């Protein structure tokens, strides 16, 4: 059967939110906003391989290029809004 990624995606999203908490700390409104976008997304997306791959990619890109972190956050926000319930 299909793999349910609900818990793995919660783990990966919390890992990315932690990176954001560390590196956008002069804008403390960013982390709660991204958290709320995640909480409002459709259940299927939140449990999907699609979201898993999105999250592993954004973590990897953020760690390689800190000078582009807001590009990666803004992209993830847009993805989450596009899958909003």
């Amino acid at each position: 059967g299909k793999k349910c990624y609900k818990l793995e995606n919660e783990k990966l999203f919390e890992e990315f939110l932690e990176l954001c908490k560390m590196q956008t700390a002069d804008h403390p409104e960013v982390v709660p906003f991204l958290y709320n976008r995640q909480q409002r997304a459709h259940s299927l997306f939140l449990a999907s391989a699609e979201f898993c791959n999105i999250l592993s990619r954004v973590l990897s890109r953020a760690r390689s290029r800190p000078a582009k972190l807001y590009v990666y956050i803004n992209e993830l926000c847009t993805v989450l809004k596009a899958h909003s319930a």
């Binding site: 804008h27 409104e29 960013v30 000078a67 582009k68 807001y70 590009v71 956050i73 803004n74």
Partner: peptide, 26 residues
């Protein structure tokens, strides 16, 4: 300081856009 967020032009635009989006959803 060139390590500022606004140094990379794409990052500068993305940051301005995101922070304005957050303000608009207050």
């Amino acid at each position: 300081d060139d390590d500022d967020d606004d140094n990379d032009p794409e990052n500068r635009i993305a940051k301005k856009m995101l922070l304005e989006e957050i303000k608009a959803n207050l």
